[PDB]
Amino acid sequence: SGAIYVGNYRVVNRHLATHNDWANLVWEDSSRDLLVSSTTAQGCDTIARCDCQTGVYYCSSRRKHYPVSFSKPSLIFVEASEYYPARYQSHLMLAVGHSEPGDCGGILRCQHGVVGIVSTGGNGLVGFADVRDLLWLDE
Ligand SMILES: CSc1cnccc1CC(=O)N1CCC[C@H](C(N)=O)C1
Numbered sequence: 001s002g003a004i005y006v007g008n009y010r011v012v013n014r015h016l017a018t019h020n021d022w023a024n025l026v027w028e029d030s031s032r033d034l035l036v037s038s039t040t041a042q043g044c045d046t047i048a049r050c051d052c053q054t055g056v057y058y059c060s061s062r063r064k065h066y067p068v069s070f071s072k073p074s075l076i077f078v079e080a081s082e083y084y085p086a087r088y089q090s091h092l093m094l095a096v097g098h099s100e101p102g103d104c105g106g107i108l109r110c111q112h113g114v115v116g117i118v119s120t121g122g123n124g125l126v127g128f129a130d131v132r133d134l135l136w137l138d139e
């Protein structure tokens with residue numbers, strides 16, 4: 001579980017999106033595992049507009065924040081699940097770190113703000129869905 005609350009938007013993993021999210025849909029992309037819904041309240045999460053490759057992510061399976069080196073956003077192949085068949089997920093960034101299935105939605109942050117959210121993982125690796133290219137979240 002976990003979401004980004006910026007302005008009148010709620011950013012979540014598409015596979016973990018609720019009924020309310022689909023009823024207040026703004027934009028969704030299965031290949032990125034992202035879904036954006038609208039909110040009445042005004043969020044204050046600052047989104048990073050950078051090319052940082054180091055940050056800190058929240059791991060709910062350990063109740064700890066971990067510092068990570070992470071890769072540039074790219075097309076990384078992801079194995080089949082009850083949410084998506086086997087495919088290439090775009091705008092994905094990998095880091096060496098701990099993750100479990102309940103960890104999806106944890107925020108990744110740098111000195112510039114919110115980079116993205118936990119989306120994939122396994123084998124000692126953790127994947128983050130980047131949100132820095134989504135410029136419309138601010139405007
Ligand atoms: C941190 S998630 C995780 C971590 N360890 C083992 C397993 C996982 C689960 C996992 O990777 N995914 C299942 C749910 C959808 C995901 C996606 N974005 O396509 C992929």
Ligand SMILES: [Zn+2]
Pocket residue numbers: 048049050051052110111112113
């Ligand atoms: Zn940054």
